[PDB]
Amino acid sequence: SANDISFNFQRFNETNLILQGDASVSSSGQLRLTNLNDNGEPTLSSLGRAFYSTPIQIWDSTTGAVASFATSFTFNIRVPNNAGPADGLAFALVPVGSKPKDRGGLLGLFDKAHTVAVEFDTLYNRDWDPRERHIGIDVNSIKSIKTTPWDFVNGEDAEVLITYDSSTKLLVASLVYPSQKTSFIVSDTVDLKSVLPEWVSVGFSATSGISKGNVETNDLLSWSFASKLS
Amino acid sequence: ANDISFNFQRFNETNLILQGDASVSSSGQLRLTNLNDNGEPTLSSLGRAFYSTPIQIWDSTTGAVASFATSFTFNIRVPNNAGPADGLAFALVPVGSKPKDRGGLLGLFDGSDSKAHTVAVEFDTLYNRDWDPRERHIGIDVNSIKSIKTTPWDFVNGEDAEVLITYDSSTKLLVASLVYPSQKTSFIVSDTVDLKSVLPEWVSVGFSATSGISKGNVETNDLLSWSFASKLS
Amino acid sequence: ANDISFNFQRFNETNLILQGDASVSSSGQLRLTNLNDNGEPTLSSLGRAFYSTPIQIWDSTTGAVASFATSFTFNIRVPNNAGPADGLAFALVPVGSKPKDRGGLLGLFDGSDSKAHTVAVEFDTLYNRDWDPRERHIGIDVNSIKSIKTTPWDFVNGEDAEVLITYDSSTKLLVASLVYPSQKTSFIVSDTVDLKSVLPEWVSVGFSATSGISKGNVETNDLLSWSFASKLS
Amino acid sequence: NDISFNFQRFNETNLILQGDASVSSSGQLRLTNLNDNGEPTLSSLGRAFYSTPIQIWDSTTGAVASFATSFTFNIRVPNNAGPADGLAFALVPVGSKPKDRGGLLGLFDKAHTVAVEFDTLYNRDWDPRERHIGIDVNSIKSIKTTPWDFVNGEDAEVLITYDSSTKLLVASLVYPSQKTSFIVSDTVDLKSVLPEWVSVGFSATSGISKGNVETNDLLSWSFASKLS
Ligand SMILES: *[C@@H]1O[C@H](CO)[C@@H](O[C@@H]2O[C@H](CO)[C@@H](O[C@@H]3O[C@H](CO[C@H]4O[C@H](CO[C@H]5O[C@H](CO)[C@@H](O)[C@H](O)[C@@H]5O[C@H]5O[C@H](CO)[C@@H](O)[C@H](O)[C@@H]5O)[C@@H](O)[C@H](O[C@H]5O[C@H](CO)[C@@H](O)[C@H](O)[C@@H]5O)[C@@H]4O)[C@@H](O)[C@H](O[C@H]4O[C@H](CO)[C@@H](O)[C@H](O)[C@@H]4O)[C@@H]3O)[C@H](O)[C@H]2NC(C)=O)[C@H](O)[C@H]1NC(C)=O
Ligand SMILES: *[C@@H]1O[C@H](CO)[C@@H](O[C@@H]2O[C@H](CO)[C@@H](O[C@@H]3O[C@H](CO[C@H]4O[C@H](CO[C@H]5O[C@H](CO)[C@@H](O)[C@H](O)[C@@H]5O[C@H]5O[C@H](CO)[C@@H](O)[C@H](O)[C@@H]5O)[C@@H](O)[C@H](O)[C@@H]4O)[C@@H](O)[C@H](O)[C@@H]3O)[C@H](O)[C@H]2NC(C)=O)[C@H](O)[C@H]1NC(C)=O
Ligand SMILES: *[C@@H]1O[C@H](CO)[C@@H](O[C@@H]2O[C@H](CO)[C@@H](O)[C@H](O)[C@H]2NC(C)=O)[C@H](O)[C@H]1NC(C)=O
Ligand SMILES: *[C@@H]1O[C@H](CO)[C@@H](O[C@@H]2O[C@H](CO)[C@@H](O)[C@H](O)[C@H]2NC(C)=O)[C@H](O)[C@H]1NC(C)=O
Ligand SMILES: CCCCCC
Ligand SMILES: CCCCCC
Ligand SMILES: CCCCCC
Ligand SMILES: CCCCCC
Ligand SMILES: CCCCCC
Ligand SMILES: [Ca+2]
Ligand SMILES: [Ca+2]
Ligand SMILES: [Ca+2]
Ligand SMILES: [Ca+2]
Ligand SMILES: [Mn+2]
Ligand SMILES: [Mn+2]
Ligand SMILES: [Mn+2]
Ligand SMILES: [Mn+2]
């Protein structure tokens, strides 16, 4: 029963995605999670999500097996002139068929949750966030089990790698800016069996801010995923 | 680029589109055609099953064509005092394609004058005199149940068959091989296929099978494992 | 579990052990056998070439046996008014083994009473009356030039042949296939081989080829590309 | 010209061992010397390379490899000692011999060498003060470092990647036991520093002075390269 799935997209197409809320694929093959107006500028209170169109098996109830996975992606978050960024984007494992949740600081993921995410959090929410912008590991809550500071760079491609090792239960997320040569990493244990259903949708969720001048694009340029169910 | 790879040692309904009689058993076998509650195959059965996300086979903007490889183990079992019919096939079909004719048309083709935009590799257990060669055969099927090429296949009742199908977009060569690990026998067929001119840009990949329409011509059409990989140049 | 994988679209001497007449050309072809000053293959030529790191095929502590898959493109060219001889083989051999007999023994086996501890897949272009089947063939060779199993091979002069060899350690099935993309012809042979009982734990993987010993029986033995993968379960 | 390997246990048969390096009966790559009590010894120097060279770039085509390596290491310091000197993953010229002991990690003394060091001993002439992960381009004086909170005797998991399209080299380390993680990244022009073909592997040294010593054990190693 040793199952695997791997995919690699250097360009996106709608045909193998479930798009929700504001998410679209551009004619240039970019996954734009949040809404652009007719002038190509990001709008307020935007919420988009996008998932690979086939569910991934994360664990097996008969055998007690848990999947290991790795994903990499390139994102571009651009803030217009005279604006600050909000709210961020996340890679997520969510229940099959789940619909977007609350927007703004809850990143379309949160509002019995069964969601694990890695957030790239561009806006301080004083009720649960650390002060600086951060990479967070989110287990059924917007209040991360662990964060690491992230020195956000406006409009420059970020390259992410997230891995999950089912033998150590360690989830590790890293981001590098090839242009700035800066890099960030966070790691914590997450018991996927105890939090997620057996099958999940994998993909992304992103929101723009709810108030004028708190806004950003949330673009994915490339995405690779691989899972192995031991 | 748009690459995809999967490996199923056990099947689950969650990542398949099942059509007609196809089911996944509680043991994780993909049973393409109908079994009664005693595990005996029924007449005039038709099932298909596809991976639930479409595969990009070629790109009209760039002219790129995918290369792919698939392997699978199948088990065709014929009840005592029957011969086998009709066979099973691995296929690339248009997204949202519905099953076609039963019996000798393997749920992939019909007697219509419309092109199926379907490429398949058939494991054909029943002679249809209007298009088949006389012996049981592996065929390469391009928009027709009349294979562009076949090779004889010495069918073995109820024994696991291991298949490998490869498509090289640089030579346009499609190659299908089958081995019976129990009998140590092997078969192979090869032909060129221009995927761009026959398939749409995106396809569903999976299987189609039919049982015979007449008493004493019947078989199971079980898949035990399936691996697929595609790479769009 | 341990693995090794490599893929060469062009050869370089830096990652090969070359023996006898084997050379790598400035165009990146692995030429196993020699050319005379007239640009024709010479008589009694013998070359071998191995990946320069040994592969672990099995483990005596764990009882694990490797599964492997290899693919390669070869070009055998015969001068006008000649027939081909003797052939080329993919082989697993003991680490540090030296070339064996010329001609019909393909540089892999000799007339000694010692076990060569060698498994090969031969592409045999010359009938040897003491042990061969009548037609040219793909053979599976276990410690002897007298193949445990062969399949006829319709040799085509000077056309690229594409080979795939797989070994599944769970069924012990070794399968070899050849296709000519130009002719769309294909051949396959399969048999079980217990690698633990024949090979040492570590082997060198690569090729062996010979040209004929008598005028008018001669060929080139060129490798154009080679991919290998092993997985020690 | 692509190459991939994965060793969950080591064997001598596919390695070039230099100086003190050995493979144990348990299949661990021990880069530095152990005494009869299984304790690490002073002034040890060991290297170990995959026994086939890797093609890193091609002068005819201008192609540069992308690569990725992962490995688990165990650095153990005896009681009443501190650690020295560290271990490194390196790309070195084919047939390269070990260089200087101690703080030079067996790699330096233009040695046409690129390395990622896990540096357990402050050398005031070139190091930053805290233990660190460094990117080393032809010098023991890293082009870039990041602090590393060394944990005595706990398994460390490393990932190093090199993307030839961005020229970005990234190294990361995690302690699964402590849930701590570290990362450093810089651009490296491999064409201008390495030969076309290299040996890939490890170099490690134990300290030269009493009470500065460590084991330098590799437990698993995966490597993959792709010459575009
Ligand atoms: C392919 O993969 C699939 C999917 O993974 C495999 O299918 C699974 O197989 C396992 C093992 O056989 C099944 O486990 C068994 O489940 C039953 C309970 O079944 C009923 O409840 C299911 C759960 O419902 C809750 O959770 C879901 C989300 O996870 C939620 O949507 C529901 O609304 C519900 O929520 C409620 O409960 C929660 C806590 O439990 C609360 O928080 C929440 O707020 C609510 O109160 C449900 O999915 C299931 O429905 C499926 O199956 C029915 C048929 O029964 C079908 O009609 C439906 O369409 C669904 O498909 C049911 O309603 C449980 O009783 C079993 O327990 C026995 O075994 C355990 C294990 O040892 C023992 O501890 C027990 O004592 C007992 O003896 C068992 O756990 C699982 O139900 C099933 N899931 C699905 C989605 O089908 C499939 O087998 C794979 N195929 C192959 C070939 O391998
Ligand atoms: C990586 O993978 C590799 C390859 O698979 C593994 O390596 C292989 O490991 C196996 C298992 O250890 C080795 O084979 C064994 O080697 C044993 C030693 O072989 C040598 O020594 C033998 C004995 O030598 C003594 O006796 C002879 C007389 O018979 C004298 O001539 C000689 O001088 C010695 O005499 C002295 O000691 C004896 C002690 O018995 C006294 O009696 C005398 O008084 C005197 O003092 C010798 O016979 C033999 O020919 C060798 O020289 C051997 O015992 C055993 O049976 C077995 O063969 C492989 O050698 C090794 N292979 C390679 C390629 O190196 C490795 O394990 C793996 N590593 C991991 C981590 O898994
Ligand atoms: C993704 O692929 C789809 C399908 O090939 C493309 O959508 C088709 O585009 C053609 C060309 O304009 C239309 O005539 C079809 O009707 C489209 N089909 C659908 C379902 O709308 C699409 O262009 C590709 N997307 C990107 C971003 O490349
Ligand atoms: C195999 O690789 C070797 C080592 O790079 C190539 O030889 C070198 O080629 C470069 C560029 O052509 C020269 O700058 C070096 O001086 C060569 N060194 C030698 C010949 O030792 C060699 O050409 C490659 N072989 C093939 C068949 O491509
Ligand atoms: C380290 C995570 C495993 C990646 C393969 C699914
Ligand atoms: C994804 C594999 C390509 C097919 C040619 C052997
Ligand atoms: C190493 C992969 C080979 C498996 C044999 C089919
Ligand atoms: C399907 C390709 C086989 C050659 C080695 C991966
Ligand atoms: C061979 C894979 C390279 C990946 C480096 C980012
Ligand atoms: Ca926030
Ligand atoms: Ca028929
Ligand atoms: Ca012969
Ligand atoms: Ca130092
Ligand atoms: Mn946050
Ligand atoms: Mn037919
Ligand atoms: Mn022969
Ligand atoms: Mn240092």
Side-chain angles (χ1 to χ4, degrees), chain C residues 86-87 103-106 122 124-129 131-133 137 145:
Chain C
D86 268 281
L105 285 146
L106 298 177
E122 59 168 55
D124 189 345
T125 59
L126 182 79
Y127 176 63
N128 293 95
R129 67 187 170 247
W131 59 76
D132 276 338
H137 53 277
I145 199 58

Side-chain angles (χ1 to χ4, degrees), chain A residues 40-52:
Chain A
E41 290 298 343
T43 68
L44 297 180
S45 287
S46 190
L47 166 54
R49 325 198 304 176
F51 300 97
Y52 180 69

Side-chain angles (χ1 to χ4, degrees), chain A residues 3-24:
Chain A
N3 293 7
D4 330 353
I5 188 263
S6 200
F7 58 77
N8 177 44
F9 303 150
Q10 294 298 347
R11 158 194 199 79
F12 290 94
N13 189 281
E14 306 84 332
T15 308
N16 56 196
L17 304 172
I18 307 161
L19 303 179
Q20 304 183 315
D22 293 334
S24 72

Side-chain angles (χ1 to χ4, degrees), chain B residues 81-101:
Chain B
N81 283 258
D86 267 281
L88 68 83
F90 166 79
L92 307 96
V93 302
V95 175
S97 154
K98 293 162 183 276
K100 305 284 198 304
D101 283 349

